[PDB]
């Protein structure tokens, strides 16, 4: 009845019906992590809402090399209430484990409740500003994710870039200009933050500006070179 | 702003006096109030032009 | 989820069937709700069960 299509990224799928929709397999049925709908065709499949997750808009925006894979491990900064890591957990499957980092407590409690229902999602309630506060728990993750709203966003990833990246491993950086300037064009911001990442051994490959989902945001894709 | 809007406050008890001013106490839009230094008199202006004068009978 | 609701929707948290009948047709909203079985509304009498 419902046509289902493999997406070019593994784990991601796109369901086709009367209305088009972006979707993902689940690890555990019988649960809505944030009250999203799901389709069951038998194999369960779960929608991504692109206006709530920037990575969801990053895929559907059209993105060449998302480094998140099934077999790979992926670290996550900015896991506020776990709305996106339960999509990241459901795209890595059981084999990949996801490291979710958050500093805020009241949305962090939802992430504590979410680790009880997911084997991949483990929480990090420590500060992402100082990575050695949680150095013992994580080692050599393949690619990381940024969703933090701090202005030193090239700084906080760089301290997670040296210590936790697999070498020649990818990086995903989500930047808003509303964090940083709110006075100049968002294009002018993106030249400033790309040059910041070349100072920290990240060679950026592509950037994609989410135009219809969030205002003036971005995603930045790079490869962390020649450091572990 | 509003007509007939002078209110007296006793001290130190911070109680507004209740008997005066009544409803029928002609004031007008009070724009200028003044006390006597010595005799205890009270002079209240208006907008109509009529400075209507009282006497605090204690003093 | 309950504390994010205002005060006036904690009155009528139970009586939702008689509420949205009374708004969709122009009528009078129920005034107690599930709060009516508190020990304190019963201590009042008359219209004071509303207040």
């Amino acid at each position: 009845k419902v046509v289902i299509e493999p997406h070019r990224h593994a784990g991601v799928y796109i369901a086709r019906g009367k209305e088009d929709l972006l979707v993902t397999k689940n690890m555990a049925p019988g649960e809505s992590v944030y009250g999203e709908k799901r389709i069951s065709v038998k194999v369960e499949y779960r929608v991504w809402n692109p206006f709530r997750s920037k990575l969801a808009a990053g895929i559907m925006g059209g993105l060449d090399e998302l480094f998140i894979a099934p077999g790979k491990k992926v670290l996550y900064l900015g896991a506020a209430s776990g709305t996106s890591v339960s999509h990241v957990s459901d795209v890595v499957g059981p084999e990949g484990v996801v490291y979710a980092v958050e500093f805020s407590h009241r949305p962090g409690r939802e992430l504590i409740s979410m680790a009880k229902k997911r084997p991949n999602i483990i929480p990090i309630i420590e500060d992402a500003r100082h990575p050695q506060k949680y150095r013992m728990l994580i080692g050599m993750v393949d690619c990381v994710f940024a969703d933090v709203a701090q202005p030193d966003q090239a700084r906080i990833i760089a301290l997670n870039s040296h210590m936790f990246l697999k070498d020649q491993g990818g990086v995903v950086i989500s930047i808003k200009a509303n964090c940083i300037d709110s006075t100049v064009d968002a294009e002018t911001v993106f030249a400033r933050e790309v040059q910041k990442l070349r100072e920290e051994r990240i060679k950026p490959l592509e950037q994609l500006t989410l135009e219809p989902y969030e205002r003036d945001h971005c995603i930045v894709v790079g490869r962390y070179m020649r450091s572990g | 702003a509003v007509k007939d809007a002078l209110r007296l406050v006793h001290l130190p008890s911070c109680s507004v006096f209740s008997n005066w001013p009544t409803s029928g106490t002609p004031l007008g839009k009070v724009t200028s109030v003044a006390f006597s230094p010595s005799g205890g008199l009270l002079a209240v202006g208006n907008e109509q032009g009529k400075v209507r004068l009282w006497k605090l009978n204690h003093y | 989820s309950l504390a994010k609701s205002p005060a006036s929707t904690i009155q009528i948290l139970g009586a939702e069937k008689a509420l949205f009948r009374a708004l969709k047709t122009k009528h009078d909203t129920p005034k107690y709700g599930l709060l009516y079985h508190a020990s304190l509304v019963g201590q009042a009498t008359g219209k004071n069960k509303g207040k």
């Binding site: 060449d64 219809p212 | 702003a1 | 708004l23």
Partner: protein
């Protein structure tokens, strides 16, 4: 007051169906997607067909840009016309709710301004130079 609940309720019927309606619907994206390339002659020899290793149609559409190696709707009835019409209507339904709700809010906004004329206070009848009538209550602390 009963009028400004029935309009107020039917607005929230229409606004909560705006969220349930947009949640199923899919918006194709149009954003800037710049590719950073190390050398200017690799830059001059760029082609979207080569870099994304796609072909004709898989360049321009962003929902599924699949590999030519990955390549190695008629199951739904009438895929060219009927399905694409019923693809369009789910927009046009929630297009109408957004046209219904914003029309229905203005019925409340002109009713709530009428309901706030009855209460207390001293009101000033002003007219703008455009001709629209609004009021300005006097600066007076209601007790």
């Amino acid at each position: 007051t009963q009028d400004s609940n029935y309009v107020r309720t039917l607005r929230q019927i229409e606004l909560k169906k705006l969220e349930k309606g947009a949640k199923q619907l899919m918006f194709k994206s149009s954003g800037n997607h710049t590719i950073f390339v190390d050398s200017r002659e690799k830059m001059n020899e760029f082609t979207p067909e080569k870099f994304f290793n796609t072909t004709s149609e898989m360049v321009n559409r962003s929902e599924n840009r699949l590999t030519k190696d990955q390549l190695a709707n008629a199951s739904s009835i009438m895929p060219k016309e009927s399905l694409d019409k019923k693809k369009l209507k789910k927009f046009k339904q929630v297009k109408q709710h957004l046209q219904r709700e914003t029309q229905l809010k203005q019925v409340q906004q002109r009713m709530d301004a009428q309901r706030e004329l009855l209460k207390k206070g001293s009101k000033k009848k002003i007219v703008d130079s455009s001709g629209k009538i609004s009021f300005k209550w006097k600066k007076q602390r209601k007790r």
